[PDB]
A paper describes a structure:
[name] (SAHH) reversibly cleaves S-adenosyl-l-homocysteine, the product of S-adenosyl-l-methionine-dependent methylation reactions. The conversion of S-adenosyl-l-homocysteine into adenosine and l-homocysteine plays an important role in the regulation of the methyl cycle. SAHH depends on the cofactor nicotinamide adenine dinucleotide in its oxidised form (NAD+), which is self-regenerated during the catalytic cycle. The protein structure of SAHHs features three domains in a monomer, the active form is usually a homotetramer.
Moreover, recombinant TmSAHH was described to only be enzymatically active after a heat-induced conformational change. To further investigate this observation, we used recombinant enzymes either previously preincubated at 95 °C or permanently handled at room temperature for crystallisation of the hyperthermophilic PfuSAHH in complex with inosine. Comparison of both structures showed no substantial differences in the conformation of the differently treated enzymes. Independent of the previous thermal treatment, PfuSAHH, as the other archaeal homologues, formed stable homotetramers in the crystal. Regarding the structures of PfuSAHH and MmaSAHH with their preferred substrates inosine or SIH, the oxygen attached to C6 seems to form additional hydrogen bonds with the carbonyl oxygen atoms of Asp348 (PfuSAHH) or Asp362 (MmaSAHH) in the main chains. This suggests that the hypoxanthine ring is in the imino-hydroxy form, although inosine has been shown to be most stable in the amino-oxo form in water. In the inosine bound complex, His298 is situated within the active site staging a His-IN conformation (gate shut) where its imidazole ring is oriented towards the γ-carboxylate group of Asp128 with a distance of 4.2 Å. The Nδ1 group of His298 is oriented to the O5´ group of inosine with a distance of 2.7 Å.
Numbering used by the authors:
A (entry chain B), B (entry chain A), C (entry chain B), D (entry chain A): 1 to 421
Write the structure that this text describes.
């Protein structure tokens, strides 16, 4: 531990490798590059203090450095104990971000470090999973009045915060960044679709083609995971609790059945529900020898590990990010990444170009809070759609794509009723 | 020829073949079969008069006969002059539906027949395109106070009616059936995806694989058309005006460019915009010899025919549903189905199982209007989502699919905010 | 019947509609257009007599007219009683092709007409299924000495002829056109893939997406049918007898099981085996109510109709090209196109651009026989690959595609062994 | 460091992690497990000496240990300097395999180690790329008469050996393992398809979806790479020199153009030609800023590095397995894995289940050489197809898949010629 008042990291001497990772991914993040250039000229966060709980790898680092280049004083804590990249965090510490995170930290350290990040007395909180916003309401009420607002990156976080609002406990405005179009249609679907399979392949070196792949949940993440599994040659089976989404999965060409039926025939299981105990004791009891299980949802409760432990006569670790649960009849079941987001724990998270768009929205949400806090209520808001459209337009221009535009005649037609057959 | 007070059809002696078509598709329409059984027992439309403007083929006939089995007196007019199937209409006339439609009728006959359908003095109007609702407001104001409400099947119709609302001229409640989940996610996407290519293949006998297919519009219809073109081995190019949708198309694996660029390289062009003049003079001037053009949108204004006519030195008709425009330099450009919905004119429309779900929603919308008209304003409404879920559950049960159900613990988890790391 | 010495057709007055079909498809057949222009200038078949057994629709007509434009006297008989298009054959009769074919002709007429075609005393026989070549060996031995050679279009035909060779009964050279690359990789795969689903959709108006589609046989036809079913949103199940092909199907993302297992869960069954009794009594007994069955193989023996008839308490005809077999328990099973090639009987066969390439090979095979008969043995041969490459090059040039070419350096590298690490 | 008569490896203390990798992948290699059980009982290689040049990762290790369990004395050298996994090699040395390989070894060490492996005086040579077979003929002629035969794993190797045969310099029989069905249809296509993208993702953390991916070569490897790129949401462009393969790519839904056209629009370039200078100076000059380039072919000559070096004003190394060539105008072009097989250098090679089947064929080829060398000429042979079928049947049984079997009536039908219409 290289720990001080301003940071706590595993080893500062890793910083040089961290910088290479940050410099690499930033070359492929044009929207955030555009924003950073604007932030550098206008310094909109001069005097502003920002605390962030995010997955601390390269792309996050580039967002945090973008906020800092806009004048912000920035602190950071891990969103997940096992998603932190120690070399990237050393680099952030060297850049003057007040970061407290060590890969594999305990649950107690996780909370201690999050408290240290809060010690900056933030005006803006950027969160991923809602633990930091939740922690401020539960244990750090003294600084509610300093806080202009928070933004939340993920589906699980937004559900928590909307529940806080309904119960009348939310004390400051929150931007649900997850609910922007340029987030959930891209990150949740295309990002998770690719990076889940990157993580699974990386941990296992197994063939995806000709496998029965069971995807639990057919929301934005699940449909991305399913689509990319099919793209890699798998036979995909979807498990859902919503009848409309179940039918969508069928029409998309996938088998649909319940969790017990899927447990009997799955080779690889991926959860993307954001829910608790989607796979549990009775499913593990049905699984084939050698079943691989991974979780893409935010918290490690989707696949219920206490149930696996109770069934197991031995728990082994045959590979990094593979835990073997050997059962009484000799079947071996494999859990990847200790049941935590497999894309972030067994790989490098979403690809750079996806987090570009998500984190461009995050940067703009911070700016929106700065610019609007005095007129917002303690409620959950969504960014105006004009920000989504601006992010899409910068991205399209960076790809060299020029699209058609609506003529005036066309706009008037679409606002008319008289033009029938 | 067979034309009186109660109906107007080409030839009643076609009825036998009409009945066979109706009986066939109804075997594969379980949701509407379920509803029909309920309507037959409870007769919710006893005493009620319903006028419908729909595409008059066999699935429509089954909806209209279902309404009649619920006790309704039913009239009907074509939604499109060229979508009518004369044999199905003969059967409807023999069943006592007051139907006025001849395939290939003129624009003036279309309106005369629509007026004849209105002569029933409807309580409920079921519309597809909003011409009948528009016609009642513009030319048949005498019967407005008899009308409880209307329902509208299609995107183009809903836009017209929302424009009528904004202008303060809408005089009764309208249900935007198009905006239900079980409609636009299934009909607009999967239905149009299949039946567009059915119609193009049927009209042309040409190969889809290894063609450059240009899809104009990447909404629900366009993404279904694109998806199925790719599934048939085409190289798909998407043209869009909305930056977010353009980026979605790129991430789905498709080229994105503007209409002039796409005009130079397209082999087959399909419009799905619901807009005017998406393809016009300067595009036709760029097209390759032998380009095929089709429209999947509601009205025949998407591909601007007056422009083709002005470019043409000859207009020929080499096949049913193919118009050849021979240009000065000798290039020949082909328009399918006279630029009208290609799925409905060159083929048999959406497949039975799709219209099952759309028309189940139509049946439920008619019932919703009956039940609730008194408490609705002269505005556009959307059916409660509970109806969508009920339609999805009946369909899943008919497919023999049993999905997972949420535990109580799970429902509480999803409503909680305290459960973090 | 308009029958004479020179032809036998249903009705000559259909010719005008026939010509429109022929003129249409020929516009999209560039390779055969190229060949026809060469044949017209060089007249390589001046004095030559050609008898053909092919599926008598538009594209075939254009091949036969191409041979005639090369100077050939041409006769023709149906390859299948139900694939004949009466209007196209009227046109051929009017053009001076000696064609004997009526759609729906009996098995006795089929043989009588084939004998009439043979009465031209052919130098070259073009066959599809090997019935005409077989008939000459069995019943018309007098004219073996006149015959330079035969070509065979299809997999089933080639197997028959290779069996004739092995048994020492083949009496003249045969070109296995089916075995050319530009045939089986394109026609058998991409052609059958599209046109099978065209035929199924056309006959039924049912949804392909979210159906369990069972494909029996995973050869060139089967893999095309499977690939396009998946492309239309089906869940595809493959039944195979070859273990290597079964594994290929699994790795392509399809379920693989035996015929009894597939019979229990299939919604739509398609046979492409070229074999006998692939689906028979015990499979029909397992099928779900409303199962649709179609055959894509050459002969109607793949789905064993005598078994369906024995199980049925009623046989009905609810639609053209749909036969209903109603079983004792009330289940209804539907056979399309009377179990004959569904693409040709319920639709218009392969698309024009595919038959362009197949029939360009047929034209070149006729020319190869003309040019080589005196040096060939009574064996089955395959066209030199240079003809395949020439067909591919003409097609690519007609699409405006210019490919890379091998440099001399590269050719030498590929012929070297010394250049290692 | 740990380098003596019997082996040469980086560090023996890595062996523990090597053994874990070997044990892991072997759990998913049922065909080779089956063979190993037979080899252990029958010891077919007792007294036999085998030298192998293969990519030295864990699946290879399992093949080599299988040969050893069959009684063989085994030596091994790297097939590529950068594919070696140091921990796996340590484990092989501890198991008594005479292995000489250090990851990152120079070209001269590569040859020195290959000579050390040859010092065992092999009866059988197992080769990947043909360098070891080539080396024995060129520099170790003294031991030719000890050598019964060689087997060759890869396409590039087989071409070299067929060139050696043609030149009359091949001195012993070679089995072209690459040419077995269960190799090129599975390894070359499905294996390379997955592991190429695994390696590109791992090296770069970039998004595949919505990229223009240029695949150079549309053979078995290229069609697998293209198929999986499309499955990951890329727009795929194929470059080919063979007109038939170019047309296949078009029908598969991909753009086809020449290398200069593709150079202008590609985002990611992957070569799979087995040829020299497919991408060279004039292509690099056309490439967009940030283009990524990777090679999937055997040798690093496909992308011509000397050309990049001459264009570059700086060569940097921003990531492991990424080389940056910064050009005069400021564009940066990135080459992955120093232009060497990207799947094996930037990742872990083909997945376990694929190498199971390829290496099962290798084991059977070694046995075939042992059993039959006396009756083979100094030529290139292909394994009897019965071995392919046996490998496929063991795999299917391990997957729990039971396929249809042919009846006797069916077998007779397929051998008959009399059964026509
Ligand atoms: N790994 C990543 O990088 C990443 C990226 C984005 C989001 N996420 C997380 O993924 C999770 C899902 O997010 P989303 O945006 O797809 O949510 P969503 O609400 O769109 O989808 C979740 C789906 O799960 C279904 N579901 C819930 N409980 C289920 C159960 N027990 N069995 C089957 N289906 C069930 C719901 O019906 C819903 O359709 C959340 O935890 C979110 O925070 C992870
Ligand atoms: N059976 C059928 O043929 C069928 C079925 C359903 C809907 N429809 C009709 O299809 C049309 C589209 O419906 P939808 O539900 O997809 O609507 P939508 O609003 O979901 O999609 C239309 C899309 O077109 C785009 N667009 C508009 N003008 C454009 C232009 N000039 N160039 C390019 N893109 C343009 C918009 O950005 C939008 O994404 C409507 O006319 C609707 O009534 C037809
Ligand atoms: N409809 C058309 O337009 C069209 C086009 C081309 C070919 N064909 C016909 O299609 C048939 C198949 O041709 P192909 O080129 O695909 O042949 P093929 O030899 O490539 O494939 C046939 C496959 O069927 C498998 N098979 C045989 N008996 C089986 C059984 N009982 N159950 C399961 N699998 C079985 C074989 O193992 C083989 O893989 C032939 O009759 C051919 O003449 C039709
Ligand atoms: N694990 C791996 O990375 C892996 C696996 C298997 C094979 N390989 C190697 O991959 C390479 C290709 O193997 P394959 O089995 O696909 O061979 P193949 O012969 O099936 O395919 C090579 C293709 O490249 C085309 N081609 C040749 N020169 C070209 C050029 N200049 N431009 C465009 N196209 C060109 C040829 O027309 C041919 O279609 C070989 O080096 C082989 O040894 C690597
Ligand atoms: O590489 C990455 N860096 C930072 N955040 C990421 C990365 N990959 C995915 N997520 C984010 O993780 C959240 C779930 O906790 C998702 O919302 C996604 O946006
Ligand atoms: O077969 C059909 N019968 C009736 N309506 C149909 C059919 N196919 C599509 N539509 C409907 O046509 C509308 C556009 O006018 C779409 O909204 C779709 O619901
Ligand atoms: O439209 C068509 N015209 C002529 N032949 C066709 C058509 N479609 C498919 N086939 C041919 O029918 C053979 C099986 O008997 C196939 O070999 C195919 O080449
Ligand atoms: O993981 C692996 N181990 C061993 N060989 C491999 C692996 N992945 C691919 N190849 C082999 O590499 C050859 C090209 O040199 C290919 O022939 C393939 O069989």
């Amino acid at each position: 531990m290289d720990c001080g008042k301003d940071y706590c990291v595993k080893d500062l001497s890793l910083a040089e490798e961290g910088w290479k990772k940050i410099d690499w991914v930033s070359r492929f993040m044009p929207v955030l590059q555009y924003i950073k250039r604007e932030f550098e000229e206008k310094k909109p966060f001069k005097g502003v203090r920002i605390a962030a709980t995010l997955h601390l790898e390269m792309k996050t680092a580039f967002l945090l450095l973008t906020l800092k280049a806009g004048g912000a004083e920035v602190s950071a804590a891990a969103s997940n104990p096992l998603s932190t990249q120690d070399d990237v965090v050393a680099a952030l510490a060297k850049a003057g971000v007040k970061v407290y995170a060590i890969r594999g930290e305990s649950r107690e350290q996780y909370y201690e470090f999050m408290h240290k990040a809060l010690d900056i007395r933030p005006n803006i909180i950027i969160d991923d999973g809602a633990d930091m916003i939740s922690l401020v309401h539960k244990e750090r009420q003294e600084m509610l009045d300093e806080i202009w607002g928070g933004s939340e990156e993920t589906t699980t976080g937004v559900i928590r915060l909307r529940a806080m609002e309904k119960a009348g406990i939310l004390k400051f405005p929150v931007i649900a960044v997850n609910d922007s179009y340029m987030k959930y249609l891209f990150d949740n679907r295309y990002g998770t679709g690719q990076s889940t399979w990157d993580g699974i392949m990386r941990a296992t070196n197994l063939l995806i083609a000709g496998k029965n792949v069971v995807v639990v949940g057919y929301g934005w993440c699940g449909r991305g995971i399913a689509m990319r599994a099919r793209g890699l040659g798998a036979t995909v089976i979807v498990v859902e609790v919503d009848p409309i989404k179940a039918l969508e999965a069928r029409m998309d060409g996938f088998l649909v059945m319940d969790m017990k039926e899927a447990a009997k025939i799955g080779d690889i299981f991926v959860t993307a529900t954001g829910n608790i105990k989607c796979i549990r004791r009775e499913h593990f009891e049905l699984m084939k020898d050698g079943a691989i299980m991974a979780n893409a949802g935010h918290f490690d409760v989707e696949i219920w590990k206490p149930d696996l432990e109770k069934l197991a006569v031995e728990i082994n670790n045959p590979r990094p990010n593979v835990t073997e649960y050997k059962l009484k009849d000799g079947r071996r079941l494999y859990l990847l990444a200790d049941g935590r987001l497999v894309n972030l724990v067994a790989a490098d998270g979403h690809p750079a170009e996806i987090m570009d768009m998500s984190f461009a929205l995050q940067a703009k949400a911070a700016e929106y809070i700065k610019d609007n806090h005095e007129r917002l209520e303690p409620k959950v808001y969504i960014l105006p759609r004009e920000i989504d459209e601006m992010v899409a337009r910068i991205k399209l221009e960076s790809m060299g794509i020029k699209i058609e535009e609506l003529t005036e005649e066309q706009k008037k037609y679409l606002e008319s009723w008289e033009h029938g057959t």
